[PDB]
Amino acid sequence: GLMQFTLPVRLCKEIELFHFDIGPFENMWPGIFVYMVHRSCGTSCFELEKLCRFIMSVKKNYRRVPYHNWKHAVTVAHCMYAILQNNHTLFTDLERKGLLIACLCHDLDHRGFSNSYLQKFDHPLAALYSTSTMEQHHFSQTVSILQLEGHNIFSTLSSSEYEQVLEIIRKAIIATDLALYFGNRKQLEEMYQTGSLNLNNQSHRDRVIGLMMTACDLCSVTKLWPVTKLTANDIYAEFWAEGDEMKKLGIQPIPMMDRDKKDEVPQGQLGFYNAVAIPCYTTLTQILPPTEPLLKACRDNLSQWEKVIRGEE
Ligand SMILES: O=C(Nc1ccn2nc(-c3ccccc3)nc2c1)c1ccnc(Cl)c1
Ligand SMILES: [Mg+2]
């Protein structure tokens, strides 16, 4: 009850900043997550014994893949923490509980492969879930872990509060399917500009939480250049392995996944910043002004990829 987590001074200060990197010491990441729940939510939100058992089972169900791993889960949770702390009064108690858990759980049991690769492989998950294939799996795995004996962190919620929280988590996790991001943001862009955006309209909140989830999920592009550049290697290591597996199915992969086309990566990063990341953080900033530092960091990294192309690195 009186048992805070407390981080060293540099982490205690930097963890509050959007661009914080959780560092290479795997064994600190659980305490970092508990620290964030305690400050974001309260020391009463969860039974520490049950939270700790939930965190360690979630970790166990992330695989040893180059990018979609336990570090990404915690990184994406930290960006949600930073958004919630900079927007104190905008979110319900349930939302603060639900979203940190949604982020930790959003890529559970990822194999390093896209929804497209599962569909072309004809993987059993593509028959079970025809759209947002991996994302419906990640939610399924979240519910499974919540139902292990001793792992129900939501047990002290009323029946209907419990239903609302699992529904916040389900939508949050589905929204991380980037296929859905384009339409979500266009709708949010129209609503903001015609002034119809209403945060008391549940279907509007859902959309805003969806964009937050895209923003946290993409937050590798909002770090300092050296973190962003080195994370890109992990991202492409998965993409190129998927490319290899496309060639094994007798299918030329898109260039993004073809290791023969490394030379074209800088221009491909540009496209991605221009078509996905910048628009994402721009609309987020319009809706939630204190998230401007994510847009600023993203723009700095666009400019660093522009320098890469001009042979200045
Ligand atoms: O980098 C990310 N996504 C993209 C998107 C489109 N392209 N296209 C190329 C590309 C490369 C070579 C040749 C032509 C095109 N490179 C990328 C990388 C990414 C994904 C998920 N999460 C994060 Cl944080 C970042
Ligand atoms: Mg995902």
Ligand SMILES: [Zn+2]
């Ligand atoms: Zn993710």
